Amino acid sequence: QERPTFYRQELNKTIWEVPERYQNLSPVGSGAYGSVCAAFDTKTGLRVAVKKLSRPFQSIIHAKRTYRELRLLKHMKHENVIGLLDVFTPARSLEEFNDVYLVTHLMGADLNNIVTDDHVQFLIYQILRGLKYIHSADIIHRDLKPSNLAVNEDCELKILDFATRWYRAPEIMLNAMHYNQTVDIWSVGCIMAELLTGRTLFPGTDHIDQLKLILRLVGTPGAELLKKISSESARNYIQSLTQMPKMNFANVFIGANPLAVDLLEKMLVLDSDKRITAAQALAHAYFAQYHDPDDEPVADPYDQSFESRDLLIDEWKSLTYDEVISFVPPPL
């Protein structure tokens, strides 16, 4: 399996050493984690995003995050989830391996590019279709929000990026000892509401304002419920506040589709063992025009045993190098 021909260039004081297939690299972004160039991929005809990781192996914590990110991106093979087009390194061996470049579809426009009930059915459907997939591999997104959702001109949607707290599940904000995949359904619920109404559902000015906004809608959780969704400290905090009744949704969402309101009632609940799952949500009558049980696929199993392991920098690096070397590009 021959090494492509590489060429070097310096753009905005960054070195990019890339296979010749990637042309007309144009700087598009920078950040603590890497720099990004938009490029033309001459092999596939696609416009791509090439990300050059920034100091991928500088600490243990960095080397592990690099590995995690590559393992995740390599796993995702779904229409509604960002996948990995390519990963490469100019290194010819593990000994010279210092730099990692990740290539994905070039996205540009996120959910907030909204410049209509049927569009919201389609958009929310796609998010849930991707989450069904992600959750089936026992992966939790944990911070889903409009900025992490790319949408093209045909309203076709992808989940990215596995910092606002407006969409975060209460059991995360309250630091519960345990939580499940349905934290992501809370977030979808907040996203759906905003698409239906055109306003942020819980626009808290800070953490405590956010909590109080939430309680005002859903009502104060009873003893057994609060205990399971909160840290010991947060449990005592909530116990100190005045109790709130549950509001009737659709006094809140006046004029939204009644099925939409019904689905929201099932997503925006504090009890994460009662909160509707991605799979169950896809079969809700709100998505009757979109739902197809034989076109909502699930994921291969994803091995996260590395997450419990404390390894040295060189071990994280070597595992990462193994995954670069073993990568097999998607059909295209």
CATH of the domain at 273: 1.10.510.10
Torsions phi, psi for 142 (to 5 deg): 90, -20
Residue 283 lies in a domain: yes
**Tokens 């989450």 sit at which residue?**
131
22 strand-pairing partners: 41
161 assigned to active site:
yes
The 3-class SS string of 25-47 reads: EEEEECCCCEEEEEEEECCCCEE
Domain count, the chain: 2
Token digits of residue 115: 């410049």
Q: Is 34 annotated as a binding residue?
A: yes
The domain that contains 76 carries what CATH number?
A: 3.30.200.20
* 32 assigned ligand-binding residue: yes
Is there a domain that residue 7 lies in? no
Cα gap 113→41, rounded to integer Å? 26
Residue 311 lies in a domain: no
Same domain, 160 and 30: no
The experimental method is: X-ray
- My answer on whether 140 and 285 are in the same domain is yes
The answer to whether 115 is a known ligand-binding residue is no
Within this chain, do residues 253 and 179 fall inside the same structural domain, yes or no?
A: yes
* Torsion region of 70: left, alpha or beta (phi above 0 gives left; psi -120 to 50 gives alpha): alpha
Residue 83 is assigned to a ligand binding site: no
Judgement on whether residues 95 and 211 belong to the same structural domain of the protein? no
Q: CB neighbours of 56 closer than 8 A, spacing ≥ 6?
A: 62, 63, 66, 98, 99, 100, 320
DSSP line for 62-85? HHHHHHHHHHHHHH---TTB---S
Burial class (CB in 10 A: 0-12, 13-18, 19+), 114: middle
End-to-end Cα spacing for the chain: 18
Q: 93 and 211: one domain?
A: no
Among the options 117, 118, 138, 161, which is catalytic? 161
Contact 117, 258 (CB under 8 A): no
Contact 273, 265 (CB under 8 A): no
Q: What share of the chain is helix, strand, coil (3-state, %, to 5)?
A: 35, 15, 45
128 Cβ contact partners less than 8 Å away, ≥ 6 residues apart = 188, 278, 281, 282, 287
Same domain, residue pair 183 and 214:
yes
| Same domain? 163 vs 21 | no
Token couple for 26: 């144009």
Cα–Cα distance, 36 to 26 (Å, whole number): 8
The answer to whether position 178 is within a domain reads yes
Q: Is 127 in the same domain as 262?
A: yes
Q: Judging by DSSP bridges, how do beta strands 86-88 and 101-105 pair with one another?
A: antiparallel
DSSP 8-state secondary structure symbol assigned to residue 326:
H
Helix (H) or strand (E) holding 111: none
Smallest Cα–Cα separation from 192: which of 268, 278, 136? 268
Q: Which of 288, 154, 301, 171 is nearest to 226 (CA)?
A: 171
Q: Is 18 a known ligand-binding residue?
A: no
Q: For residue 33, say whether it is annotated as part of any ligand binding site.
A: yes
Which of 36, 35, 37 has the alpha carbon at shortest distance from 23? 37
Residue 323 lies in a domain: no
Query: Has residue 260 been placed in a domain?
Result: yes
Q: Are residues 120 and 99 in the same domain?
A: no
- The answer to whether the annotation marks 147 as part of a ligand binding site is no
Give the E-state strand segments of the chain in sequence order.
6-11, 14-19, 22-29, 34-41, 46-53, 86-88, 101-105, 149-151, 157-159
Helices 183-197, 117-136: crossing angle, 10 deg rounding? 170
Are 87 and 224 members of one domain? no
Residues 27, 51 contacting (CB under 8 angstroms): no
Domain-ending residue, one of 108, 143, 161 = 108
- Are residues 235 and 290 part of one domain? yes
Number of residues in the chain: 332
Alpha-carbon torsion 169, 171, 173, 178, what sign?
negative
Let me know if residue 159 belongs to a domain.
yes
Tokens, residue 202: 């819980």
Q: Which amino acid is at 104?
A: T
Range of 20's domain? 16-108
